[PDB]
Amino acid sequence: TEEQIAEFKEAFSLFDTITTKELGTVMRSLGQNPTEAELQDMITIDFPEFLTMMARKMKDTDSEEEIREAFRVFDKDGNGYISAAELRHVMTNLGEKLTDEEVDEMIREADIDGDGQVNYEEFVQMMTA
């Protein structure tokens, strides 16, 4: 996060300092598109604090992307659910020494609704905890 800091600094300085309206202008001028949601969410604004908030956003979106990729690792058929068969196949194909009952237990732990599978909400809960 360095040259990206330079890009953010140039984007802000184009508006130099900043207001809410200006915040939306700078977010759109950086390629983003903040809903009035995020606008009022924060919600004048300096540049250090703008860098902090943009860093927050980037971190949250990167974590969302990372967890979605992680889910794609196990949801072998992309139906939105990790079955026991899928997790077993993955653990085998990735060289892990988990037994079949261990795979069933991995699923059971994250199976909040009890359908024998792990949807994405349950997967995120397991990862964001």
């Binding site: 979605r68 992680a70 794609r72 690792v73 196990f74 072998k76 058929d77 992309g78 139906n79 079955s83 026991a84 068969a85 899928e86 077993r88 196949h89 993955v90 653990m91 085998t92 194909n93 990735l94 060289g95 892990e96 988990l98 079949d100 009952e101 261990e102 069933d104 237990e105 991995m106 732990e109 994250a110 024998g116 599978q117 397991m126 990862m127 905890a129």
Partner: protein, 483 residues
């Protein structure tokens, strides 16, 4: 937190980040991107959802079966870097088919996926999963061609059974066969999921046999497919842990099936003790005979009979003995064809099903033949009704423990007429019987003349005018005795 396996999840995640794209050297990313409409099916709701996807598909197929060819495809996730896009196999029928076949194939696979989840709910030693499959439509192409799409799975592909009796014996696995049999029982014999194949227990391209035999494409062999499965099926420890009643095979068929019992005992899948018992239905003729106290299982046994006769199970001469075994099982389960056939066979009479099979004459077989023929008559088989009328009339094929009874014979003649001998013939025979009386039936000149006139009219229908005149004369003669 409450998860003592998060270390395992994350270890797998990073290991996967280090694994390479198995299709990298095919450079699907370099392919010109194409638009497609993805149609996906929800089998619980019976509802289709169509969205728009971008796919890169190989220009030439990498595989070709008898019916379909397969293209390596990458598809971008609507939920970026094409290099990391997910790998899919896209299948197309080589020969042009009706567009509805693709959607029916998706329905087949998604139904089988539901059945895999049902089997998993009974806590099996190894769980199964049928991979989702959807359709992509390439509308920007000539003729808006359709493709099946499934995720690519790395691993050793194995067909564990076919839709036609094949079972893999080299390192026999229990779970696929147990799953097929489970679907048979749990559906109440209404369907069976076969063609179990895939990587490990991730199945694909399954086939379903249904009683109607009308759905799920040209691979639905119906009760014939159920028969093909159960002819080869050896129940295993999983079948028993779930309460699956064995299929009633012949002693010879059971020996052939047991030829792999040592392999079954040496199989790798061991039970856990947590398995659960199977509206369901039993694959055994005993519990089904109680259930009946009209049967799909009887239709399966009858199909087995016809496959034995047709040489399907022939490896030497066709079994005949087992054909009769399954014909009897079908009969006791109420298949009218089987009851008629066994009544004719035990009565040493010409029969259609198992025609070249003659049973040894025994007096017990005479009683069995007439009993089966009377059952068939009471069930509405006209042929049997005429044979039973003739038996009560003349004694031909009558059970020795029964007596000629012209009242019963008249009953069955008239039941035949009210439903390859002409009708005027039976009407005139009733007329003769009432003209003389006998065997418990009293002379009835008036009714004899009435029936002779009915026979005369029926002869007139069949153009037999001179026979009609003889019958009118016989009616006049019957009435001339009165007064």
């Amino acid at each position: 937190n409450s998860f003592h396996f998060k270390e395992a999840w994350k270890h797998a995640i990073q290991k996967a980040k280090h694994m390479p794209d198995p299709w990298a050297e095919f450079h699907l990313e370099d392919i010109a991107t194409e638009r497609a409409t993805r149609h996906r099916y929800n089998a619980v709701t019976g509802e289709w959802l169509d969205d728009e996807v971008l796919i890169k598909m190989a220009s030439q197929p990498f595989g070709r079966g008898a019916m379909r060819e397969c293209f390596r495809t990458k598809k971008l996730s609507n939920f970026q870097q094409w290099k990391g896009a997910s790998n899919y196999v896209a299948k197309r029928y080589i020969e042009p088919v009706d567009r509805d076949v693709y959607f029916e194939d998706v329905r087949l696979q998604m139904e089988a996926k539901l059945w895999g989840e049902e089997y998993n709910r009974h806590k099996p030693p190894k769980q199964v999963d049928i991979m989702q499959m959807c359709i992509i439509e390439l509308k920007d192409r000539p003729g808006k061609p359709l493709f099946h799409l499934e995720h690519y799975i790395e691993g050793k592909y194995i067909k564990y059974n076919s839709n036609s009796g094949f079972v893999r014996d080299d390192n026999i696995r229990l779970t696929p066969q147990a799953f097929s049999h489970f679907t048979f029982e749990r559906s109440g014999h209404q369907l069976i999921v076969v063609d179990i194949q895939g990587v490990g227990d991730l199945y694909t391209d399954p086939q379903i046999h249904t009683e109607t035999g009308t759905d799920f494409g040209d691979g639905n062999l119906g009760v014939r497919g159920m028969a093909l499965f159960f002819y080869s099926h050896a129940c295993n420890r999983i079948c028993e842990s779930m309460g699956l009643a064995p299929f009633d095979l012949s002693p010879r068929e059971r020996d052939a099936v047991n030829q792999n019992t040592k392999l079954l005992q040496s199989a790798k899948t061991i039970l856990r003790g947590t398995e659960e018992k199977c509206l369901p239905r039993a694959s055994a003729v005993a519990l089904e005979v109680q259930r009946l106290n009209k049967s799909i299982l009887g239709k399966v046994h009858l199909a087995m009979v016809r496959y034995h006769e047709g040489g399907r199970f022939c490896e030497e001469e066709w079994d005949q003995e087992s054909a009769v075994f399954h014909l009897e099982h079908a009969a006791n389960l109420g298949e009218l064809e089987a009851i008629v056939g066994l009544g004719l066979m035990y009565s040493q009479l010409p029969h259609h099903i198992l025609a070249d099979v003659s049973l040894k004459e025994t007096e017990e077989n005479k009683t069995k033949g007439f009993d089966y023929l009377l059952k068939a008559a009471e069930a509405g088989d006209r042929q049997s009704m005429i044979l039973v009328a003739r038996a009560f009339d003349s004694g031909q094929n009558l059970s020795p423990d029964r007596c000629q009874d012209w009242l019963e014979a008249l009953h069955w003649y008239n039941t035949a007429l009210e439903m390859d001998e002409p009708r005027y013939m039976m009407l005139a025979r009733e007329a003769e019987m009432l003209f003389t009386g006998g065997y418990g039936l009293e002379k009835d000149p008036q009714r004899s003349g009435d029936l002779y006139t009915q026979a005369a009219e029926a002869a007139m229908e069949a153009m037999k005018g001179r026979l009609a005149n003889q019958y009118y004369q016989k009616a006049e003669e019957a009435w001339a005795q009165m007064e």
